[PDB]
Design an enzyme around this catalytic site. Sequence first.
Site, PDB file in Angstrom:
ATOM      1  N   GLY A  98     -11.450   7.777  -7.699  1.00 52.15           N
ATOM      2  CA  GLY A  98     -12.290   8.805  -8.274  1.00 52.15           C
ATOM      3  C   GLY A  98     -13.118   9.586  -7.277  1.00 52.15           C
ATOM      4  CG  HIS A 118      -4.156  14.314  -6.671  1.00 48.49           C
ATOM      5  ND1 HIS A 118      -4.854  14.688  -5.543  1.00 48.49           N
ATOM      6  CD2 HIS A 118      -4.858  13.301  -7.231  1.00 48.49           C
ATOM      7  CE1 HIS A 118      -5.937  13.940  -5.431  1.00 48.49           C
ATOM      8  NE2 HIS A 118      -5.964  13.091  -6.443  1.00 48.49           N
ATOM      9  CB  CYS A 132      -9.738  12.870  -5.038  1.00 44.86           C
ATOM     10  SG  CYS A 132      -8.702  11.714  -4.120  1.00 44.86           S
TER      11      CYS A 132
HETATM   12  C1  LIG Z   1      -8.476  10.479  -5.361  1.00 46.04           C
HETATM   13  O1  LIG Z   1      -9.738  10.223  -5.933  1.00 46.04           O
HETATM   14  C2  LIG Z   1      -7.907   9.257  -4.659  1.00 46.04           C
HETATM   15  C3  LIG Z   1      -8.817   8.791  -3.518  1.00 46.04           C
HETATM   16  C4  LIG Z   1      -8.339   7.464  -2.932  1.00 46.04           C
HETATM   17  C5  LIG Z   1      -8.461   6.241  -3.826  1.00 46.04           C
HETATM   18  C6  LIG Z   1      -8.459   5.087  -2.836  1.00 46.04           C
HETATM   19  N1  LIG Z   1      -9.079   5.687  -1.659  1.00 46.04           N
HETATM   20  C7  LIG Z   1      -9.067   7.016  -1.678  1.00 46.04           C
HETATM   21  O2  LIG Z   1      -9.549   7.760  -0.808  1.00 46.04           O
HETATM   22  N2  LIG Z   1      -6.572   9.570  -4.145  1.00 46.04           N
HETATM   23  C8  LIG Z   1      -5.468   8.924  -4.535  1.00 46.04           C
HETATM   24  O3  LIG Z   1      -5.482   7.990  -5.335  1.00 46.04           O
HETATM   25  C9  LIG Z   1      -4.148   9.399  -3.925  1.00 46.04           C
HETATM   26  C10 LIG Z   1      -3.450  10.375  -4.870  1.00 46.04           C
HETATM   27  C11 LIG Z   1      -2.157  10.990  -4.337  1.00 46.04           C
HETATM   28  C12 LIG Z   1      -1.503  11.872  -5.389  1.00 46.04           C
HETATM   29  C13 LIG Z   1      -2.416  11.781  -3.065  1.00 46.04           C
HETATM   30  N3  LIG Z   1      -3.266   8.293  -3.595  1.00 46.04           N
HETATM   31  C14 LIG Z   1      -3.631   7.365  -2.694  1.00 46.04           C
HETATM   32  O4  LIG Z   1      -4.646   7.395  -2.036  1.00 46.04           O
HETATM   33  O5  LIG Z   1      -2.703   6.400  -2.613  1.00 46.04           O
HETATM   34  C15 LIG Z   1      -2.948   5.339  -1.654  1.00 46.04           C
HETATM   35  C16 LIG Z   1      -4.012   4.394  -2.135  1.00 46.04           C
HETATM   36  C17 LIG Z   1      -4.330   4.304  -3.479  1.00 46.04           C
HETATM   37  C18 LIG Z   1      -5.310   3.428  -3.916  1.00 46.04           C
HETATM   38  C19 LIG Z   1      -5.976   2.632  -3.016  1.00 46.04           C
HETATM   39  C20 LIG Z   1      -5.669   2.709  -1.677  1.00 46.04           C
HETATM   40  C21 LIG Z   1      -4.691   3.588  -1.238  1.00 46.04           C
END
Ligand SMILES: *[C@H](O)[C@H](C[C@@H]1CCNC1=O)NC(=O)[C@H](CC(C)C)NC(=O)OCc1ccccc1
EC number: 3.4.19.12
Lengths: 301, 301
Positions: A143, A41, A145
Amino acid sequence: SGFRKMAFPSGKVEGCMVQVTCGTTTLNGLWLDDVVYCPRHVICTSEDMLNPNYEDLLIRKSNHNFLVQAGNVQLRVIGHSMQNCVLKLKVDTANPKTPKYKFVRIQPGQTFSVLACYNGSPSGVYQCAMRPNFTIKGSFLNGSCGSVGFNIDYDCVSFCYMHHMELPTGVHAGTDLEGNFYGPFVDRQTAQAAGTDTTITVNVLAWLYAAVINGDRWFLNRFTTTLNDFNLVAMKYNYEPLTQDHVDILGPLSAQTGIAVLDMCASLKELLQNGMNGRTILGSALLEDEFTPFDVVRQCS
Amino acid sequence: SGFRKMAFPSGKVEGCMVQVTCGTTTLNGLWLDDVVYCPRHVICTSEDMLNPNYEDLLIRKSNHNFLVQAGNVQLRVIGHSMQNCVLKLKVDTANPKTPKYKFVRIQPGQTFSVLACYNGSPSGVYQCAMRPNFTIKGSFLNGSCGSVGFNIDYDCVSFCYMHHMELPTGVHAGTDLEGNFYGPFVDRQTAQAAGTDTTITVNVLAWLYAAVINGDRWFLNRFTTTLNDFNLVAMKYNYEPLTQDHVDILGPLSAQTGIAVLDMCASLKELLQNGMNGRTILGSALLEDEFTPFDVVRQCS
Ligand SMILES: *[C@H](O)[C@H](C[C@@H]1CCNC1=O)NC(=O)[C@H](CC(C)C)NC(=O)OCc1ccccc1
Ligand SMILES: *[C@H](O)[C@H](C[C@@H]1CCNC1=O)NC(=O)[C@H](CC(C)C)NC(=O)OCc1ccccc1
């Protein structure tokens, strides 16, 4: 003496953490030999992440869309491919810090060390247990991931997790190093619910054995119970049923303390029924289930 | 999101861990530049350790009595000296993995990462807080002495602890990297008691702010109290009195959550008086005091 939630030394993993950039999205990558592994992603915009066609976004990309940085040194991407939910970016340079490694997939109830990373720079290390519902209770911000989970048996690093997302309940989900997700989750930002969780029973008993080894004996009793009678009280308190292997795994801990396995379940059934009465076990007022029997033996050796 | 007890990446410290042998006693050493730092009781036998004359045992030693191993490579000791409770073994080789470092002495209430080592090989890493009575609650077995505690501000490693002994209560004691002991302890195997401990109040409040940042808000209330009125309830429950600086240190956390510092103390006074009523905060049924306000900001950034 003493028992602490203890992560593996992260030096071998620190040397493989890179930064992967695509468009306006930046996450971490794992640099093993001549391939950089990162969540797929990274090729998505905030537009795409609700329901992306990862196959469609990938064809419209090419090598110069991926900026890979190993510290200050820029890495040249000479190829790209997708393995399920993981992007494989082949680079020209073989990582000289590449340790002996294995790509393992762990079972729920097992533990591993998470090296938290941001912009390719390690930030912290801590232990996590794969919950029965295939989630982990970690510490991940934006950030994070691309950060990986791992174990170390000897000089070999068994990579077992790569972070991808956070669930609405504040818990986290990811894949193995082959891109296959742990649990019924997808790398899309939709409504995704983790299944109902349960307490790892064999881990609580092993943790209770670590307490007896370290001088905590107030919960102990003289009476016993059968494996099929203890599974009755476990099903009541959302605990996993206990199997004969689980008893056999708890064998050495039962021998070191001279306390039969079923004897500890009687204390556990008392602890579940009678509570803990405002006292502590190994500094905890709750029953801990994130220590495997191996984790106890490694610290209480 | 998520809050976890998180240690610093240990790679920079892993490259400096050696093995120091003298007679039949083996512990760990810290290899910085061209000096190996290790506890001075490595020169003692089990005979000597009850009441040793460390100055007398040292004169009757010389360089070939110290076997220093950096992995499989044997290091040649070309000199030895004693700085308080630390043995300084000058070696011919400058450690090529020597990072930018400082020799710091921390205050009670501050935290640091402990890299557990045995026979010069890192075994695990975890966080510890220097208790008000100058002890730490770690995980140390036989052969763990010489393992160091450290913090990382940027690329510099601030060494702050070296392990020496375990107290009768299962707690651990050591020195700074200049050999000066934390607390009223001596490197002799006699009857030594740690002073009465107290709960780090400012750390509990910062930990409560980390809970609000992560969605835990059940303990919050609308009422307030004064700093001199909250110190009344703190003195009752063996808590440290709160100072204006401690409030100023809790400034940013109070601003990020929109909860005044004295407002959180009212909830803390309720939590101390009314208990927690069988509920949890950040997965804990107890009030945690081993997270500094800096530790919260670093994770909840
Ligand atoms: C990648 O770095 C990121 C890690 C997330 C950011 C918040 N806590 C984490 O572990 N992953 C994402 O942003 C992810 C991306 C999708 C394409 C899988 N989406 C996600 O986690 O959405 C839910 C969310 C976003 C922001 C804060 C809390 C939950
Ligand atoms: C050095 O490696 C060792 C570390 C101890 C071993 C048990 N837990 C630890 O943290 N230190 C000693 O053995 C120490 C040596 C004196 C000369 C300071 N003595 C000591 O800790 O005595 C008390 C004790 C010994 C063994 C088990 C539990 C407590």
